[PDB]
């Protein structure tokens, strides 16, 4: 309900690197005072959360246009089992930056060869039990 | 990228050689033109002397 996100995806086989472009976003819900939020998008490889990339902060727009580009130096063999995460955050100067949305893209569903660029609907990020342990015994 | 660069070097060399080929083609064509003009001159003179020698031969055999 927050809005949609237009992004670009393609792989450069000449340098063996992933080219992820953040085009823009639309119809984002407002969380700030003026009637518009201050959005910025954090993008990182889904498999390992290392070297996350963040875009510049846009002031008071529910339709931010970033038109930015990020490069993930990852071989083509490892790429297949690697996912992409694009999460939209709301900037706040005096508090925690609340997450507006998130989107995950499996690299086995992605087809490289033609330059991909699409709009995808944003969804609410996941917050389960912490322990995840089990004990087995018998009663008689 | 080594594959790509190697190829890049190749294309650069091909570029240079192509430029030299251009220069050579220009010199070639120009000299061909000038030589064609010279050949025209040669045929003019040769026809002139052909007429000269035909008339002269006729006049020479006339007094025989
Ligand atoms: Mg704010």
From Swiss-Prot, chain A:
Glycosylated. Residues 1-120 form the C2 domain. Ca(2+) 2 binds at residues 31-32, 90, 92, 98. The modification Phosphoserine is found at residue 124. Ca(2+) 1 binds at residues 32, 38, 90-92. Coiled coil: none annotated. Ca(2+) 3 binds at residues 92, 95-96, 98. The modification Phosphotyrosine is found at residue 89. Belongs to the synaptotagmin family. The first C2 domain mediates Ca(2+)-dependent phospholipid binding. The second C2 domain mediates interaction with SV2A and probably with STN2. Calcium sensor that participates in triggering neurotransmitter release at the synapse. May have a regulatory role in the membrane interactions during trafficking of synaptic vesicles at the active zone of the synapse. It binds acidic phospholipids with a specificity that requires the presence of both an acidic head group and a diacyl backbone. A Ca(2+)-dependent interaction between synaptotagmin and putative receptors for activated protein kinase C has also been reported. It can bind to at least three additional proteins in a Ca(2+)-independent manner; these are neurexins, syntaxin and AP2. (Microbial infection) Receptor for C.botulinum neurotoxin type B (BoNT/B, botB); interaction is improved in the presence of gangliosides. BoNT/B toxin binds to the membrane proximal vesicular domain of Syt1 (residues 32-51). This is Synaptotagmin-1. It comes from Rattus norvegicus (Rat). The gene is Syt1. The chain holds residues 141 to 281 of 421 of the full protein.
Curated annotation (Swiss-Prot), chain B:
The record marks 41-42, 58-59 as: (Microbial infection) Cleavage. Palmitoylated. (Microbial infection) Targeted and hydrolyzed by C.botulinum neurotoxin type A (BoNT/A, botA) which hydrolyzes the 197-Gln-|-Arg-198 bond and inhibits neurotransmitter release. The modification Phosphoserine is found at residues 15, 48. It is found in: Cytoplasm, Perinuclear region; Cell membrane; Synapse, Synaptosome; Photoreceptor inner segment. It comes from the Eukaryota. Residues 2-63 form the t-SNARE coiled-coil homology domain. Part of the SNARE core complex containing SNAP25, VAMP2 and STX1A;this complex constitutes the basic catalytic machinery of the complex neurotransmitter release apparatus. Recruited to the SNARE complex following binding of the SNARE complex component STX1A to STXBP1. This complex binds CPLX1. Found in a complex containing SYT1, SV2B and syntaxin-1. Found in a ternary complex with STX1A and VAMP8. Interacts with HSC70 and with SYT9, forming a complex with DNAJC5. The interaction with SYT9 is inhibited in presence of calcium. Isoform 1 and isoform 2 interact with BLOC1S6. Interacts with CENPF. Belongs to the SNAP-25 family. t-SNARE involved in the molecular regulation of neurotransmitter release. May play an important role in the synaptic function of specific neuronal systems. Associates with proteins involved in vesicle docking and membrane fusion. Regulates plasma membrane recycling through its interaction with CENPF. Modulates the gating characteristics of the delayed rectifier voltage-dependent potassium channel KCNB1 in pancreatic beta cells. This is Synaptosomal-associated protein 25. The gene is Snap25. The chain holds residues 141 to 203 of 206 of the full protein.
């Amino acid at each position: 309900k927050l809005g949609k996100l237009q992004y670009s995806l393609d792989y450069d086989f000449q340098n063996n690197q992933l080219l992820v472009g953040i085009i823009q976003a639309a119809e984002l819900p407002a969380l700030d005072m003026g009637g518009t939020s201050d959005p910025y998008v954090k993008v990182f490889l889904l498999p390992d959360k290392k070297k996350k990339f963040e875009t510049k902060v846009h002031r008071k727009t529910l339709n931010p246009v970033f038109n930015e580009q990020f490069t993930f130096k990852v071989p083509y063999s490892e790429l297949g089992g690697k996912t992409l995460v694009m999460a939209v955050y709301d900037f706040d100067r005096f508090s925690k930056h609340d997450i507006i949305g998130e989107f995950k893209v499996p690299m086995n569903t992605v087809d490289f060869g033609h330059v991909t660029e699409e709009w995808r609907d944003l969804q609410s990020a996941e917050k389960e039990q912490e322990k995840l342990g089990d004990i087995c015994f018998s009663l008689r | 990228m080594a594959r790509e660069n190697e190829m890049d070097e190749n294309l650069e060399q091909v570029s240079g050689i192509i430029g030299n080929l251009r220069h050579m083609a220009l010199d070639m064509g120009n000299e061909i033109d000038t030589q064609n003009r010279q050949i025209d001159r040669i045929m003019e003179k040769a026809d002139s002397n052909k007429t000269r020698i035909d008339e002269a031969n006729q006049r020479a055999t006339k007094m025989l």
